[PDB]
């Protein structure tokens, strides 16, 4: 359940789109990523598997991406739980961390406000 490597690998070879097995949180990550401007639309099909639809992330609609050099790292099975106070910022801004909360995500202000740091990405 690592979309990040799927993205990195396709992003490296400047692929137009990629089909990632869908899960609720992998759906909710792709939309966080889409907040910038990736994904145009997907095709929900008759469900046989729970993810056959995939995420269909299409960050390279044109020849070259305006949003290129996508990079992620902080995804270990050893759980890394952030304090609302001590949520990090990727590159001191210019990068986001998908901090899984009971009710919120994203910036440093969206930590002391929202609360549960939980997961931490880059």
């Amino acid at each position: 359940a690592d979309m990040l490597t799927r993205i990195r690998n396709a992003n490296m070879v400047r692929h137009e789109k990629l089909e990632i097995p869908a899960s609720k949180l992998k759906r909710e990550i792709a939309e966080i990523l889409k907040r910038e401007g990736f994904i145009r639309d997907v095709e929900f099909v008759e469900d046989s598997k729970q993810g056959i639809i995939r995420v269909f992330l299409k960050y390279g609609q044109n020849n070259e991406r305006v949003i290129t050099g996508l990079k992620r790292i902080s995804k270990p099975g050893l759980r890394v739980y952030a304090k609302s106070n001590e949520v990090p910022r990727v590159l001191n801004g210019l990068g986001i961390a998908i901090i899984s909360t009971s009710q919120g995500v994203l910036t440093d202000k969206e930590a002391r406000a929202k609360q549960a740091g939980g997961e931490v990405l880059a």
Binding site: E36, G37, V66, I67, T68, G69, L91, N92, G93, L94, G95, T107, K109
Partner: protein, 158 residues
């Protein structure tokens, strides 16, 4: 542009022939504006002028610019070339160029005045520090990122 040149090192190198050892000098020279531009330099295993000539080409070929938010770089970056590994980390005002030897030369002639820099492997490792300064230009200041993303500058930072 108005370049200043700095001599990093001059090592006597040698080829062996039937006669014996035949010596040349390989000079390594950093060159830069002191205002965002800086060049690698090689020295063609002969002299310093040969080094300067190649340096002044590499300033405009390689490091097209060194991004500079104030008197420091935009973000923290790890420059790696071979076993070169430089940490280049943005500092506060009045910090100084805290860096070691060859790294200092680059950052001084780049015009960076406030930076923290640790070397994690050492041997005229200017190529590694060059790759980081380019890696800043991947996400310079914030104008590109915002434009690349599809956002404003204050939207991106806060």
């Amino acid at each position: 542009l108005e370049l200043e040149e700095r001599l990093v090192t001059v090592n006597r190198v040698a080829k062996v022939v039937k006669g014996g050892r035949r010596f040349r000098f390989a000079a390594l020279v950093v060159v830069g504006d002191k205002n965002g531009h800086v060049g690698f330099g090689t020295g063609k295993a002969q002299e310093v002028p040969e080094a300067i000539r190649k340096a002044v080409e590499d300033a405009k070929k390689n490091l097209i610019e060194v991004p500079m938010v104030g008197t420091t770089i935009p973000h923290e970056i790890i420059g790696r070339f071979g076993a070169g590994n430089i940490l280049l980390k943005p500092a506060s005002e009045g910090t100084g160029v805290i860096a070691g030897g060859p790294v200092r030369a680059v950052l001084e002639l780049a015009g960076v005045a406030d930076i923290l820099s640790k070397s994690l492997g050492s041997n005229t490792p200017i190529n590694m520090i060059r790759a980081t300064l380019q890696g800043l230009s991947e996400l310079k200041r914030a104008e590109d990122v915002a434009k690349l993303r599809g956002k404003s500058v204050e939207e991106l930072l806060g």
